[PDB]
Design a protein around this nucleic acid. Structure first.
Lengths: 109, 124, 87, 103, 94, 106, 91, 110
DNA sequence: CTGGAGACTAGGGAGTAATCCCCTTGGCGGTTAAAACGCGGGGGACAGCGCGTACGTGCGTTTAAGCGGTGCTAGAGCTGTC
């Protein structure tokens, strides 16, 4: 019917591999939000920093600032990675693109 | 106090066995207006750190000079050292050396056969 | 009563929809499966450089808690300056 | 006092002479080209400003009017990576303890 | 013809300033980069790329020169400009 | 012996001398850009910004060294883009992309 | 090659010097007909932990004697204490 | 006895089958006494580990030989027990499942 | 081998530098108390791999004409003086 699936039939024009992405592209560009769960992230920053400082303590602004900086950095990598894929006649970002993006910027080496 | 050696008996560089102008470090800190006060132990720490950086690169340059079979160090030796080691590449990633040249880079398509580097056992 | 657990990799807490959302935020139609690990791997190295800078500020000030000021100082050097939370 | 001398005593802060002495103290019989001398003359000065820039900013952040070995050692760890940081501080604390052990 | 032709340049005014970096010159720099194949359109495009770098560095240099009350641009101004341009240069000003 | 009638010349196939040129150029330590054409270019550009200016005969050399390093490093980054796109040639879209990922193109 | 001149990456590779033929001989001496691939890595890991425990005791013996040189007596004390007594060196 | 790696031939059912040379190797390696693993690479391993444990430390030939000989004997004894763990299942290949069981039974790791 | 500037010393009264007196200043470590974001919950569309398929891209080869580099020949901007 509208979108049956179930046992399965030859589907007509439906939500194609890019269709919901555009909906997610529109949604995440229409508004500003954080796309990373805070509680596991709070564990993540504390876990790695345990070796450098034992019983490390954080602040409410500090964890959010680190998440925002990390989230922006990943997004900044994605915009460069996506353009590299198109440069390689592809619309899917792949690990070959991510290797070049950090190397050319000097972050990888 | 004392009643003898009312002159320059020794320098601040010789205090720690150093050879760099520790007094110049103190004057440069005041000249640059880094702070209203600079305590003792800062220039001697900085001079030792600067001396270590000077010595390590020069030793690598001397070793690179031996590779090129030349007694005096041409600027080319500096470029090889700063890029060979990841330790020095981080500090001088965006740094150019005058007349230093570049390292003999190579890539996959930069070879006779189609994307293959089976050749080895000679410098790479 | 202060129980401690030897460090286990909890960086895998970043889930595929979370990586998908970040990719969709950057205008990505399709994302490779291996990049899901690489994106968390990139998060690890980026975080590690930041905290290594961050803990040095706290160590110099003998202050255990991580200040928003200290985070910005580490980020300002690396170029990842984040406006807000500081003054 | 002058009056016959060119008075061309303009001074640019240079480290080439001290760098040359370090070369002889690590390589007994080795020379340096004047072309490479200009490279390291600006290099050590740039390193000095970069390290002092970290120390000055660190002191300002902590609301302190003084810089000592604590700030520079913080700067050395803060810039120098890996074994370089470990050895640079090792030379750093070696210098201060001998400085305090002199008359 | 092999000589005695009309396409012999013969001028240096209002020309060759932007084309002084000819085809072998860009090839020489590219070969120093290690590359193997050069696109035909890369030569004209590289002219625009070099323009943005030359303009920015000089833009800081002229402002430095005006501040020092001098009519001559020194290597120190270039070095100071290059420090904030992401391409630091060592070997000048000493 | 004669002006015309020589046999087939000993010419290398396309893309051959690049291997020989690669080894020579990485070992060199000199500017590959003629100094005199570069000297005239910088004066013309600076004329718009400042009516009258001079040079120390060392800043001109310094500008060439920085420009060559800026181009060569960009060419090295450009070469990485070409292989990533499965092609030896570096198209004009490679340099534009290469400076886009880096801090350039701004 | 004087001075520090120390290059230390995040990883280590001197463990990998003990390679498959070295592991193969021990497996054959124990009668093992065939050995899986990941055993080579685990055997290197077993060697690392076993050596680390032995050296911990031996280091304490060496410093208690104010010695900067290790000797057969010092390693015997660590081995005898751990139960893996060795006969042939020292006595 | 002909090998002939060339295209001609479909190989042989018995060409030093997996384990037959092992059956030859077990006889050879149980008939003589020797140090099995490499000496110098093991010497660097001992020096590197001790370097982190103690900044300065000298070594002698007798000390390093004792450590290597004990380690080889410890590994050989472990392989005998691990192979006994292998025979528990209907298999002749030593696997990480067996080494975990053998070590846990002993005082190691438990 | 013939000049010149810098790096070493000899001296003289103030500044910054270690030392040490007292009242107010910030993080820690324990308690607290109602809102909040996290665990697993069970299937659905929606999209990564791994075959096509169906084709315009970059490589493989040979002429060509200026195009690189070098000798002269006169000047033209860049070193130093007061």
């Amino acid at each position: 019917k509208s979108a049956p699936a179930t046992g399965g039939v030859k589907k007509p024009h439906r939500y194609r591999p890019g269709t919901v992405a555009l909906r997610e592209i529109r949604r995440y560009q229409k508004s500003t939000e954080l796309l990373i769960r805070k509680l596991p992230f709070q564990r993540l920053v504390r876990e790695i920093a345990q070796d450098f400082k034992t019983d490390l303590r954080f602040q409410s602004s500090a964890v959010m600032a680190l998440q925002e900086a990390s989230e922006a950095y990943l997004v900044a990598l994605f915009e460069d990675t996506n353009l590299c894929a198109i440069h390689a006649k592809r619309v899917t970002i792949m690990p070959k693109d991510i290797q070049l993006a950090r190397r050319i910027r000097g972050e990888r080496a | 106090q004392g009643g003898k050696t009312r002159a320059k008996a020794k320098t601040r560089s010789s205090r720690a066995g150093l050879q760099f102008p520790v007094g110049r470090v103190h004057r440069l800190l005041r000249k640059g207006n880094y702070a209203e006060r600079v305590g003792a132990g800062a220039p001697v720490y900085l001079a030792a750190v600067l001396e270590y950086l000077t010595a390590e690169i020069l030793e690598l340059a001397g070793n690179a000079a031996r590779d090129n079979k030349k007694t005096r160090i041409i600027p080319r030796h500096l470029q090889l050292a700063v890029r060979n080691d990841e330790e020095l590449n981080k500090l001088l990633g965006r740094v150019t050396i005058a007349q230093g040249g570049v390292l003999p880079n190579i890539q996959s398509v930069l070879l006779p056969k189609k994307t293959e580097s089976s050749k080895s056992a000679k410098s790479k | 009563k202060r129980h401690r657990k030897v460090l286990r990799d909890n960086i895998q807490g970043i889930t595929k929809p979370a990586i998908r959302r970040l990719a969709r935020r950057g205008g990505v139609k399709r994302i490779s499966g291996l990049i899901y690990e690489e994106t968390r791997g990139v998060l690890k190295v980026f975080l590690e450089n930041v905290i290594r800078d961050a803990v040095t500020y706290t160590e110099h000030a003998k202050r255990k808690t991580v200040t928003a000021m200290d985070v910005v100082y580490a980020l300002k050097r690396q170029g990842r300056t984040l406006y807000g939370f500081g003054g | 006092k002058k009056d016959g001398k060119k008075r061309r005593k303009s001074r640019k802060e240079s480290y080439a002479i001290y760098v040359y002495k370090v070369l002889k103290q690590v390589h007994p019989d080795t020379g340096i080209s004047s072309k490479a001398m200009s490279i390291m003359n600006s290099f050590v000065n740039d390193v000095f400003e970069r390290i002092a820039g970290e120390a000055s900013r660190l002191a300002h952040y902590n609301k302190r009017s003084t810089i000592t070995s604590r700030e520079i050692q913080t700067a050395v760890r803060l810039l120098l990576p890996g074994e370089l940081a470990k050895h640079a501080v090792s030379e750093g604390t070696k210098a201060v303890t001998k400085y305090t052990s002199a008359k």
